[PDB]
Ligand binder design. Structure first.
Ligand SMILES: [Mg+2]
Ligand SMILES: [Mg+2]
Ligand SMILES: [Mg+2]
Ligand SMILES: [Mg+2]
Ligand SMILES: [Mg+2]
Ligand SMILES: [Mg+2]
Ligand SMILES: [Mg+2]
Ligand SMILES: [Mg+2]
Ligand SMILES: [Mg+2]
Ligand SMILES: [Mg+2]
Ligand SMILES: [Mg+2]
Ligand SMILES: [Mg+2]
Ligand SMILES: [Mg+2]
Ligand SMILES: [Mg+2]
Ligand SMILES: [Mg+2]
Ligand SMILES: [Mg+2]
Ligand SMILES: [Mg+2]
Ligand SMILES: [Mg+2]
Ligand SMILES: [Mg+2]
Ligand SMILES: [Mg+2]
Ligand SMILES: [Mg+2]
Ligand SMILES: [Mg+2]
Ligand SMILES: [Mg+2]
Ligand SMILES: [Mg+2]
Ligand SMILES: [Mg+2]
Ligand SMILES: [Mg+2]
Ligand SMILES: [Mg+2]
Ligand SMILES: [Mg+2]
Ligand SMILES: [Mg+2]
Ligand SMILES: [Mg+2]
Ligand SMILES: [Mg+2]
Ligand SMILES: [Mg+2]
Ligand SMILES: [Mg+2]
Ligand SMILES: [Mg+2]
Ligand SMILES: [Mg+2]
Ligand SMILES: [Mg+2]
Ligand SMILES: [Mg+2]
Ligand SMILES: [Mg+2]
Ligand SMILES: [Mg+2]
Ligand SMILES: [Mg+2]
Ligand SMILES: [Mg+2]
Ligand SMILES: [Mg+2]
Ligand SMILES: [Mg+2]
Ligand SMILES: [Mg+2]
Ligand SMILES: [Mg+2]
Ligand SMILES: [Mg+2]
Ligand SMILES: [Mg+2]
Ligand SMILES: [Mg+2]
Ligand SMILES: [Mg+2]
Ligand SMILES: [Mg+2]
Ligand SMILES: [Mg+2]
Ligand SMILES: [Mg+2]
Ligand SMILES: [Mg+2]
Ligand SMILES: [Mg+2]
Ligand SMILES: [Mg+2]
Ligand SMILES: [Mg+2]
Ligand SMILES: [Mg+2]
Ligand SMILES: [Mg+2]
Ligand SMILES: [Mg+2]
Ligand SMILES: [Mg+2]
Ligand SMILES: [Mg+2]
Ligand SMILES: [Mg+2]
Ligand SMILES: [Mg+2]
Ligand SMILES: [Mg+2]
Ligand SMILES: [Zn+2]
Lengths: 99, 83, 138, 208, 104, 124
RNA sequence: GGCUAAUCCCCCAUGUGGACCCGCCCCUUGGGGUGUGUCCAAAGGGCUUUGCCCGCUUCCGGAUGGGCCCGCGUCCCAUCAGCUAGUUGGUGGGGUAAUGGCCCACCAAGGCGACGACGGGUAGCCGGUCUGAGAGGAUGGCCGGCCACAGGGGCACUGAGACACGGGCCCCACUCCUACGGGAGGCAGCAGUUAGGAAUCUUCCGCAAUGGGCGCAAGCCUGACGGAGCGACGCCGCUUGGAGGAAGAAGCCCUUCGGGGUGUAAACUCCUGAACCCGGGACGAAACCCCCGACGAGGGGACUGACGGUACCGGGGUAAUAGCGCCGGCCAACUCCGUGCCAGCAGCCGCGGUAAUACGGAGGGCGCGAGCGUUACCCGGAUUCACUGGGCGUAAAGGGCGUGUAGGCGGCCUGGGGCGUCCCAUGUGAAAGACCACGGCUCAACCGUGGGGGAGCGUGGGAUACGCUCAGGCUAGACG
RNA sequence: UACCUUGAGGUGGUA
RNA sequence: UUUU
C-alpha cells in the first residue's frame, strides 16, 4: 500500500481551500458593487468595482481563475455597473470605467 | 513537446529504426508526425543511415528535441556541422 | 405519348430489320437525327432522310443488310445484329472517359451523348470526354 | 521429408521413365524397361478410360514427381509462376529448373536429383563462393554453382565430374569440369527443356 | 468553406427562426437511378426577414442554439408555395396512415 | 422489379439457419448421458442403432449417435458431442466423439482409427 | 497547543506589455488598430564567482496536442407509426477556454416523422482482413488511428490538461479486519490462481537497445519495451539418407496352380553424414559523460550488453522419427475373407435381407507428409435476392375491380441558367497492409528501401449533348 | 430361439 | 402383405 501521492491529495486540499477563499471575495465584492450601482451610489459603487477588478486579475495571476475567465468577470461587472448607473449615476471616481 | 527519435520497425533480432518527428507522448511505434530518415544499427547494407538534413533542420528550428541517439545519428549525417 | 423516344427509334429499327424492311419511319427529333448521323457514318444504315408523313416530320431510316445466303433460310446476315438502349428514363447512365466501355473488342460501338455532342466511344475517347452512355450497337 | 521409398514404382504408375536414379535408369533395368505396367496387384489388367480429372492429376504428378518437390512447395512455385508476368506454364518450368538441387543435377555434379539434393544439404556445394545447403535455393542468372574445395577430393565427386568430361550440357548452362564449377547462364527457355510433361494440363489441374 | 445550401422556407411559426426544406439529388450507390432526398434546416432569421415560400440560401454558422446552426445568407426568389404545398400535403398525407389511413 | 422498386425495397439478404444448435457455435459441446439405447432406422433401412439422450452444458438436452462396432456408455457417462446428423435417424443431429471422456474408443479397430479414437496398435 | 524555511502565500512598486468598459477607424459574427479611465507581473538557486549555467515574470508568435460545430456515409424488425416539455424557438442571465435548452427565469407554441420519427434487437468504428472474374458478400483477432470503460451508480476537487485504472467523496453489492463503535479493498497492468468452457502459456531474464518521467549531471524509476519459456496454433525452411543392387529372398496377398503382387523394396557393398562432441565466438553500442576547442561546430577519450557462450565459423563424427485420410458414383485408388436389412456405413445419391470394389479385416492402391483427418464458422460454386445478373398463362409468383394521394416516369422547336452529368488543375486520401522492383538474414517465411495506382470529398476554371430548372413556341399525346 | 414359406421379411402354421 |  502507501503510495506517496496522497501528498498530491493533501496539497489539492490546501489549494482547494485557497481558491475557494479567493473566489468568494470576488463574488462578494462584485455583488456589492452591482448593488451600490443599482442604487445610484456612483462614487463608491465604482470604488468597489475597482477592488473586484483587482481581485479578479489577481486571482488570474496563479491558477485560481486564470484565463479569459478573469476577463469575463471583469467584463460582465463593468457591463452591469455602467449600465445600472443609468439611473442618473454619472461616473465620479471613474475608478475603472473609461467614459 | 515534439521530438526527433527512433521508431522500431525491423523484426525480432532484425531491428530497423526510423528517425522520426513525433509528439513525445505517443507510442514509440505509433502515429508519427513525419519520417525524416532511417537507420540500421547492424549496417547490414552500405546504406544503413539516411537523414534529410533539410527537414531535420526544419524541425530542430521549431522545438523538436532529439533523443541522444537520434541527436548522434543526426550529427553523423551532417545535421549540425557548420564549418 | 412515347415514354423513351430514343428507345422507340432504337426499337423501330431493330424490329424493321428483323423482317428486312427497305426503310422505316420514326418521329423526328434533332437528337434522334444526331444518332442516325452516326449509324450512317459507322455504316449500319444505308443512311436516312427527312420525310413528312401525314403532315408531320419523320425520318426515313434506310436499312442495310448482308447478301442472300446459301442453304435454307437465305435471309441475309444483319449489318445491325444488335442495338440496345442503355441509359433510360428511370436509370440514367453516365460514365467518365475512363469508364467509356469497348463494345465487342472494338468490333462494335457505343453511342454516348456528351457536352461536346453525340459521339461514338472512339470519338468520345479521342475528344477525351465522357457522358451519358446512350446505347450499344454492333 | 521428400518421399523416400520405392521410386522406380512412380516411374511405373506414371507409365514413363522418370530419372530418379541417374545410372541404372539407363541400364536394362529401370523396370520401365521391361515391366511397364503400374505397381500393385492390378497393374496388368486392362485400364479403364481415365477421367479428364485423372489425366491432369497424373500429369501434375509426373512433372512434380520429377523434381522430387513436395506438393506444398510445388504448389507455391506454381502460384508464384501464375502471379508473375509471362506465360505461366513456361515460367513455372523455369522456376523449377532454378532450384539449386536441380542445377547441381543439370551440371552433373550429381547423378540424380535426390543425390544432388543430399550434396547440397551436406554442404558440398557452393554458390558464388559461400556454400549453400538449401535444395530449394533459387539460382539467379550469372551465379557460379560449384563444389567446395574441401569436397573436390571425394570419390563420388570424382567419378561424377569425371564422367562429365567430354559430355555436353544444357545451353542455358556452362561447365568447367576441371574447375568443378559451372554457371547458370539463362532461365531455360521452354524449348530448351524436353520434359515428358504437357504443362498446359498442369495449369488446368490447378484451375479446377 | 462554411457550407452553403438552398431551400424553401416551409415554416414561419418561430421567433427569429425559419425551417428551410433543402432538397438534394444523387445517384443510388447500387441502383444508379438518380434519387432525390431532402432535409429541413432551422436557420436563423434575426430580423424575421424571410417568409413562407422564399427560396433562400443557408450558410453554415456558429451555433445559435440547439437544433439551429445556419443563418439565412440571402433571398434567391420570393413567393412560391407550389413547393410549400408539396411539403404541406406530404405531411397531411401522414394524416392517418396509422391505425386508420391518411387522406387522398 | 423496376429499379425504382429496388430503390424502394432492395433485395433481401439470405439468413443462414444452423443445423447444429451446439450453441456458442462451438465446435464441440460436452454433456452427460440421460439415457442410452437402440433406435430403429427409417425409410428403407433396418437395424438397432445406438443413440443417447445427452444433458448438454450448452443448456440443451439432445440425442446423439454412437458410432462404432460397440460402446460403453451409461445413464451417467460424460460425453463430448461433435455434430453430424445420422441420415437415417430423424432427430439425431450430432455424433458422440469416441475416445473422449467416459466414451472409450473402438476396440480392435484397425483402419479409420483417428475417428473412433483408437491408438495405433503396437503391431510388429 | 507552540516553533520554523523556501522557487510556499500575500501587500506595495516598476507597465515592455496585456486584460476590461466607453468612443472612433479598418475589418466583418467575438478579427485588427487606436484614445482616455481602471486593473495585472516575478524566485530564486549553482558555480570552472563581476560572469556563465539552471530557473522566475509579462507579452507576441511558432510547433505539437486538443475542445466545440457542420455536409455526407454507417446493421436487423413496420407483427414498433405516430413521438416530444427543456420539448422547438425567443429575450435576459448563469456556466466554460469556447458556441449551444448545456442550465435557469421569463415569453412564444413550437420541433420530429413513411426520404421511416418513436420503440425493440444486435453491435465499439476504421486503416484493413477473408472470399470473389468483378460487382459484391463476410469480418474488424494481431498491428496502427479514433472512441468508451476501470466492481455497479452518481460527484466534484487539484491541475495546462482528469471528472482522473494503480487520486478523493457518497450510495450499492461482495471480501477482509473488528474491543461491534468503526475501519480496509477493487489485476479490463505483467505473471499467476480459481470458476466457466471444446479451448488459450511463464508467479521467467534484462534495462544492454529503442522509448518515456524526473534530474545541470552522475543517475534513479520504467512487467512500456528488448529477449527467453511453454503450445505443430499458423507460415516458411530442413531431416528420417544418396548410388549400386535378382527376370527377382523370405513372409504376407492373389491364383485359370503355369504364375501374378508387395519389389530395387529389403538383405548386402560403397559414399555422404542430421544428431552429438572439441575449439573459437558476434553484430545489435555509441552516445550521455570527460578532455581540447567558446559547455557551439569539429576532434579526442572512457563506460556499457538480458538475449549468450546463443547465432555464425573451423575440426571431429553416427544410416539416424512416419504417420493420417481415403479407394460405389461425384472423386485419384480393387481384390480375397468375414458378416447376412445383422453388425454397421453414410457429405449428397445410397450400401447391408449368403458372390457386398459401399459393413469389419487383410493384401494391394490413390492422396498428402510432421502431419493428416474431424467438427464449427465465413466467402465461393449460387444469375439460388439476379446492380453487374432472375423472374410471375400451366413450375413459386398479377393485387377481385375501380377511383385516386404521395411518389416514379415525360411529346416537338428555341433561348437563359449550369443543379445532375462530363473535363482540366489543385488540395486531401497517415503508417502498416496489398501490388512492382531492388536489397538484408546461406533460402524462404520475416524484414528493409524505393516506385506506382487509387474511389470519395474540398477548391478554382471550363463544356452544354442528355437529365433538371426558368422563359417562349408548337400540335402528332391528352382533353373538349 | 428352430423348421414350414419367402429372395429376405411381416403375419400365420407346426414345439 | 414390408422391402428389391
Ligand atoms: Mg513528490
Ligand atoms: Mg448497366
Ligand atoms: Mg503467369
Ligand atoms: Mg437398407
Ligand atoms: Mg469408413
Ligand atoms: Mg497551530
Ligand atoms: Mg502599459
Ligand atoms: Mg506602452
Ligand atoms: Mg501591482
Ligand atoms: Mg510564486
Ligand atoms: Mg495550434
Ligand atoms: Mg431505431
Ligand atoms: Mg457489446
Ligand atoms: Mg458471384
Ligand atoms: Mg488495433
Ligand atoms: Mg465507475
Ligand atoms: Mg465505484
Ligand atoms: Mg501540472
Ligand atoms: Mg481548475
Ligand atoms: Mg489516475
Ligand atoms: Mg475517479
Ligand atoms: Mg474518464
Ligand atoms: Mg489495479
Ligand atoms: Mg493478469
Ligand atoms: Mg472445466
Ligand atoms: Mg532502459
Ligand atoms: Mg533512456
Ligand atoms: Mg520498483
Ligand atoms: Mg515483450
Ligand atoms: Mg516374393
Ligand atoms: Mg514372389
Ligand atoms: Mg536405396
Ligand atoms: Mg559497434
Ligand atoms: Mg547509461
Ligand atoms: Mg563536442
Ligand atoms: Mg476413380
Ligand atoms: Mg455393397
Ligand atoms: Mg461376401
Ligand atoms: Mg466409400
Ligand atoms: Mg472395406
Ligand atoms: Mg513443413
Ligand atoms: Mg456457401
Ligand atoms: Mg451471389
Ligand atoms: Mg437459398
Ligand atoms: Mg436485375
Ligand atoms: Mg428463377
Ligand atoms: Mg396447380
Ligand atoms: Mg401457380
Ligand atoms: Mg386480374
Ligand atoms: Mg390470385
Ligand atoms: Mg401524380
Ligand atoms: Mg423531356
Ligand atoms: Mg440551354
Ligand atoms: Mg435548356
Ligand atoms: Mg454544374
Ligand atoms: Mg483526387
Ligand atoms: Mg497508405
Ligand atoms: Mg536476398
Ligand atoms: Mg513500404
Ligand atoms: Mg468545381
Ligand atoms: Mg451555355
Ligand atoms: Mg412549354
Ligand atoms: Mg434371414
Ligand atoms: Mg428393406
Ligand atoms: Zn527408374
Amino acid at each position: 500500500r502507501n503510495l506517496s501521492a496522497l501528498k498530491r491529495h493533501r496539497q489539492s486540499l490546501k489549494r482547494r481551500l485557497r481558491n475557494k477563499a479567493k473566489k468568494s471575495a470576488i463574488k462578494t465584492l462584485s455583488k456589492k458593487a452591482i448593488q451600490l450601482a443599482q442604487e445610484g451610489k456612483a462614487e463608491e459603487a465604482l470604488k468597489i468595482m475597482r477592488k473586484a477588478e483587482s481581485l479578479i486579475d489577481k486571482a488570474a495571476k496563479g491558477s485560481t481563475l486564470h484565463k479569459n475567465a478573469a476577463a469575463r468577470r471583469k467584463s460582465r461587472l463593468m457591463r452591469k455597473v455602467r449600465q445600472l448607473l443609468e439611473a442618473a449615476g454619472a461616473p465620479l471616481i471613474g475608478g475603472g470605467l473609461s467614459a | 513537446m515534439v521530438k526527433i527519435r527512433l521508431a522500431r520497425f525491423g523484426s525480432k533480432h532484425n531491428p530497423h529504426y526510423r528517425i522520426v518527428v513525433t509528439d513525445a507522448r505517443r507510442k514509440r511505434d505509433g502515429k508519427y508526425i513525419e519520417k525524416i530518415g532511417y537507420y540500421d544499427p547492424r549496417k547490414t547494407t552500405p546504406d544503413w543511415l539516411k537523414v534529410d538534413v533539410e527537414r531535420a533542420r526544419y524541425w530542430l528550428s521549431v522545438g523538436a528535441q532529439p533523443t541522444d541517439t537520434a541527436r548522434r545519428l543526426l550529427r553523423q549525417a551532417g545535421v549540425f556541422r557548420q564549418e | 405519348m412515347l415514354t423513351d423516344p430514343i428507345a422507340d427509334m432504337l426499337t423501330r429499327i431493330r424490329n424493321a430489320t428483323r423482317v428486312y424492311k427497305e426503310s422505316t419511319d420514326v418521329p423526328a427529333s434533332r437528337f434522334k437525327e444526331e444518332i442516325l448521323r452516326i449509324l450512317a457514318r459507322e455504316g449500319f444504315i444505308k443512311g436516312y432522310e427527312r420525310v413528312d408523313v401525314d403532315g408531320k416530320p419523320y425520318l426515313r431510316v434506310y436499312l442495310k443488310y448482308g447478301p442472300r445466303r446459301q442453304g435454307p433460310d437465305p435471309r441475309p446476315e444483319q449489318v445491325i445484329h444488335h442495338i440496345r438502349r442503355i441509359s433510360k428514363p428511370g436509370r440514367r447512365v453516365y460514365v467518365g472517359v475512363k469508364e467509356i466501355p469497348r463494345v465487342r473488342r472494338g468490333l462494335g460501338i457505343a453511342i454516348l451523348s456528351t457536352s461536346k455532342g453525340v459521339l461514338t466511344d472512339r470519338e468520345a475517347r479521342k475528344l477525351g470526354v465522357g457522358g451519358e452512355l446512350i446505347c450499344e450497337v454492333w | 521429408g521428400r518421399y523416400i521409398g520405392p521410386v522406380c514404382r512412380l516411374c511405373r504408375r506414371e507409365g514413363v521413365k522418370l530419372y530418379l536414379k541417374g545410372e541404372r535408369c539407363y541400364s536394362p533395368k529401370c523396370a520401365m524397361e521391361r515391366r511397364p505396367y503400374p505397381p500393385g496387384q492390378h497393374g496388368q489388367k486392362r485400364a479403364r478410360r481415365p477421367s479428364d480429372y485423372a489425366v491432369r492429376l497424373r500429369e501434375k504428378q509426373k512433372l512434380r514427381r520429377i523434381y522430387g518437390i513436395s506438393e506444398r512447395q510445388f504448389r507455391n512455385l506454381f502460384e508464384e509462376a501464375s502471379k508473375k508476368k509471362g506465360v505461366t506454364g513456361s515460367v513455372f518450368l523455369g522456376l523449377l529448373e532454378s532450384r539449386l538441387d536441380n542445377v547441381v543435377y543439370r551440371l552433373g555434379f550429381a547423378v540424380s536429383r535426390r543425390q544432388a539434393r543430399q550434396l547440397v544439404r551436406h554442404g558440398h556445394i557452393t554458390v558464388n563462393g559461400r556454400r549453400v545447403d538449401l535444395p530449394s535455393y533459387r539460382v539467379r542468372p550469372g551465379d557460379e554453382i560449384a563444389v567446395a574445395e574441401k569436397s573436390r577430393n571425394l570419390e563420388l565427386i570424382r567419378q561424377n565430374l569425371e564422367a562429365m568430361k567430354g559430355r555436353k550440357v544444357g545451353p542455358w548452362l556452362s561447365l568447367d569440369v576441371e574447375g568443378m564449377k559451372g554457371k547458370f547462364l539463362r532461365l531455360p527457355d521452354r524449348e530448351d527443356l524436353a520434359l515428358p510433361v504437357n504443362e498446359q494440363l498442369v495449369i488446368e489441374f490447378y484451375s479446377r | 468553406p462554411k457550407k452553403v445550401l438552398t431551400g424553401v422556407v416551409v415554416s414561419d411559426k418561430m421567433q427569429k427562426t425559419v425551417t428551410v426544406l433543402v432538397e438534394r439529388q444523387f445517384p443510388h450507390p447500387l441502383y444508379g437511378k438518380v434519387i432525390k432526398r431532402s432535409k429541413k434546416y432551422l436557420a436563423h432569421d434575426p430580423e424575421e426577414k424571410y417568409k413562407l415560400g422564399d427560396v433562400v440560401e443557408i450558410i453554415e454558422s456558429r451555433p445559435i442554439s440547439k437544433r439551429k446552426r445556419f443563418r439565412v445568407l440571402r433571398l434567391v426568389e420570393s413567393g412560391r408555395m407550389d413547393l410549400v404545398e408539396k411539403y404541406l400535403i406530404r405531411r397531411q398525407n401522414y394524416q392517418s396512415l396509422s391505425k386508420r389511413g391518411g387522406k387522398a | 422489379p423496376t429499379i425504382n422498386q429496388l430503390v424502394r425495397k432492395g433485395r433481401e439478404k439470405v439468413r443462414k439457419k444452423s443445423k447444429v444448435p451446439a450453441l456458442k457455435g462451438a465446435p464441440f459441446r460436452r454433456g452427460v448421458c440421460t439415457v442410452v439405447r437402440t433406435v430403429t432406422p427409417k425409410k428403407p433401412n433396418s437395424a438397432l442403432r445406438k443413440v443417447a439422450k445427452v444433458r448438454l452444458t450448452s443448456g440443451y438436452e439432445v440425442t446423439a449417435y454412437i458410432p462404432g462396432e460397440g460402446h460403453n456408455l451409461q445413464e451417467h457417462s460424460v460425453v463430448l458431442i461433435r455434430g453430424g446428423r445420422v441420415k437415417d435417424l430423424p432427430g439425431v443431429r450430432y455424433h458422440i466423439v469416441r475416445g473422449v471422456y467416459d466414451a472409450a474408443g473402438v476396440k480392435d479397430r484397425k483402419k479409420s482409427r483417428s475417428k473412433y479414437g483408437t491408438k495405433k496398435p503396437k503391431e510388429a
